[PDB]
Design an enzyme around this catalytic site. Sequence first.
Site, mmCIF file in Angstrom:
data_model
loop_
_atom_site.group_PDB
_atom_site.id
_atom_site.type_symbol
_atom_site.label_atom_id
_atom_site.label_comp_id
_atom_site.label_asym_id
_atom_site.label_seq_id
_atom_site.Cartn_x
_atom_site.Cartn_y
_atom_site.Cartn_z
ATOM 1 N N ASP A 74 14.109 11.533 6.843
ATOM 2 C CA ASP A 74 14.219 10.539 5.765
ATOM 3 C C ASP A 74 13.556 11.016 4.471
ATOM 4 O O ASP A 74 12.779 10.287 3.828
ATOM 5 C CB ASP A 74 13.700 9.163 6.215
ATOM 6 C CG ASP A 74 14.217 7.998 5.360
ATOM 7 O OD1 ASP A 74 15.303 8.141 4.738
ATOM 8 O OD2 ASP A 74 13.547 6.959 5.324
ATOM 9 N N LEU A 95 0.518 -1.354 -1.129
ATOM 10 C CA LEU A 95 1.050 -0.124 -1.715
ATOM 11 C C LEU A 95 2.561 -0.003 -1.509
ATOM 12 O O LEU A 95 3.232 0.654 -2.303
ATOM 13 C CB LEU A 95 0.313 1.116 -1.169
ATOM 14 C CG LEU A 95 -1.220 1.140 -1.350
ATOM 15 C CD1 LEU A 95 -1.841 2.285 -0.583
ATOM 16 C CD2 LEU A 95 -1.626 1.170 -2.838
ATOM 17 N N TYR A 136 9.476 -0.867 8.917
ATOM 18 C CA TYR A 136 8.458 -1.212 9.902
ATOM 19 C C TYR A 136 7.093 -1.451 9.248
ATOM 20 O O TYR A 136 6.357 -0.503 8.962
ATOM 21 C CB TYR A 136 8.384 -0.167 11.034
ATOM 22 C CG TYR A 136 9.574 -0.193 11.970
ATOM 23 C CD1 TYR A 136 9.592 -1.028 13.083
ATOM 24 C CD2 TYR A 136 10.670 0.637 11.757
ATOM 25 C CE1 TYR A 136 10.683 -1.051 13.952
ATOM 26 C CE2 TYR A 136 11.766 0.623 12.619
ATOM 27 C CZ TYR A 136 11.767 -0.222 13.717
ATOM 28 O OH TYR A 136 12.843 -0.238 14.571
HETATM 29 C C1 LIG Z 1 6.269 4.133 4.179
HETATM 30 N N1 LIG Z 1 5.022 4.869 4.340
HETATM 31 C C2 LIG Z 1 4.122 5.175 3.392
HETATM 32 C C3 LIG Z 1 3.094 5.851 4.012
HETATM 33 C C4 LIG Z 1 1.878 6.425 3.384
HETATM 34 C C5 LIG Z 1 1.077 7.337 4.062
HETATM 35 C C6 LIG Z 1 -0.052 7.822 3.427
HETATM 36 C C7 LIG Z 1 -0.363 7.379 2.155
HETATM 37 C C8 LIG Z 1 0.470 6.440 1.561
HETATM 38 C C9 LIG Z 1 0.194 5.978 0.157
HETATM 39 O O1 LIG Z 1 -0.785 6.372 -0.470
HETATM 40 N N2 LIG Z 1 1.140 5.157 -0.344
HETATM 41 C C10 LIG Z 1 1.367 4.733 -1.672
HETATM 42 C C11 LIG Z 1 0.414 4.740 -2.691
HETATM 43 C C12 LIG Z 1 0.756 4.246 -3.956
HETATM 44 N N3 LIG Z 1 -0.185 4.193 -5.001
HETATM 45 C C13 LIG Z 1 0.015 3.453 -6.248
HETATM 46 C C14 LIG Z 1 -1.404 3.076 -6.667
HETATM 47 C C15 LIG Z 1 -2.366 3.652 -5.602
HETATM 48 C C16 LIG Z 1 -3.806 3.963 -6.095
HETATM 49 C C17 LIG Z 1 -4.756 2.810 -5.817
HETATM 50 C C18 LIG Z 1 -3.855 4.347 -7.567
HETATM 51 O O2 LIG Z 1 -4.311 5.093 -5.357
HETATM 52 C C19 LIG Z 1 -1.535 4.730 -4.926
HETATM 53 C C20 LIG Z 1 2.067 3.799 -4.140
HETATM 54 N N4 LIG Z 1 2.997 3.793 -3.171
HETATM 55 C C21 LIG Z 1 2.652 4.233 -1.959
HETATM 56 C C22 LIG Z 1 3.698 4.080 -0.874
HETATM 57 F F1 LIG Z 1 3.959 5.234 -0.257
HETATM 58 F F2 LIG Z 1 4.852 3.621 -1.338
HETATM 59 F F3 LIG Z 1 3.301 3.246 0.097
HETATM 60 N N5 LIG Z 1 1.573 5.959 2.161
HETATM 61 C C23 LIG Z 1 3.493 5.920 5.354
HETATM 62 N N6 LIG Z 1 4.652 5.318 5.560
#
Ligand SMILES: Cn1cc(-c2cccc(C(=O)Nc3cc(N4CC[C@H](C(C)(C)O)C4)cnc3C(F)(F)F)n2)cn1
EC number: 2.7.11.1
Length: 263
Positions: free
Chosen positions: A122, A12, A17
């Site tokens: 951030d 994703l 980090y």
């Molecule tokens: C740096 N950091 C991130 C997090 C963090 C904490 C909680 C939840 C997420 C998260 O859902 N990230 C995410 C999702 C998705 N998508 C795209 C498709 C996908 C689907 C299959 C359609 O559901 C959902 C894209 N980008 C990101 C992210 F953020 F860039 F990583 N990230 C903690 N530190």
Amino acid sequence: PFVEDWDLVQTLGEGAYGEVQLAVNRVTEEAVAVKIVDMCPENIKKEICILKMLNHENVIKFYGHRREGNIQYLFMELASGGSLFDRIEPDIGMPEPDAQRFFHQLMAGVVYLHGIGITHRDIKPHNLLLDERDNLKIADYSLATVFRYNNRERLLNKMCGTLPYVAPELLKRREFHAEPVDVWSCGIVLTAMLAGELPWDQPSDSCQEYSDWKEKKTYLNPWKKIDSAPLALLHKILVENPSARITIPDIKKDRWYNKPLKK
Ligand SMILES: Cn1cc(-c2cccc(C(=O)Nc3cc(N4CC[C@H](C(C)(C)O)C4)cnc3C(F)(F)F)n2)cn1
């Protein structure tokens, strides 16, 4: 690749980090986000402590953590709508009603964090995620810190954040208040949403785009793409002196903030 009962299906994101992966439970089919971190041990200790405090509709939910040798797995609420970054059309932005809705939700999340004595440090569109109903969720607590403890405010001195989003006092002061820094980054996010363009690489003395803004040269981009009402709010948020900068209670009283909008 797998962790206990979870399969790590899709990358994703990748950053400072580790990596964030889509984790699907083999048995239940529940889909969550897993942050994978190599090694820092004192940093993740602080991060997990902050993550366990978080309970708000506009803040990412933390489920728990697993350690497999030197690899830490941080289980968090999935944001199925992806990032706010991918809703911003370069050089255009997005419809003003969508930007206003996302801005109200961002304020709700920031008020919550500040209320529990946590500064994000951030705030940017890559860290602002969306759920299935397009609700904004503040993500990534790797730079987050305690600025208020036992009703006692602690000034910050650490350089962190992302330069186009950082407040000018970080670059000019030895110590500074946490809350106006997060408010400033929210004003840059609002600029990005309404103009699809960042105004400067950093708010420094050497930066001509920043001097142009301080001189009120709003006939220039990105400001010329923004309506007079949200522009008046940006003029109160992107104020060089943090003690003169608008606070979140006063943002909630702003004309644009309270203006009815529909596509
Ligand atoms: C740096 N950091 C991130 C997090 C963090 C904490 C909680 C939840 C997420 C998260 O859902 N990230 C995410 C999702 C998705 N998508 C795209 C498709 C996908 C689907 C299959 C359609 O559901 C959902 C894209 N980008 C990101 C992210 F953020 F860039 F990583 N990230 C903690 N530190």
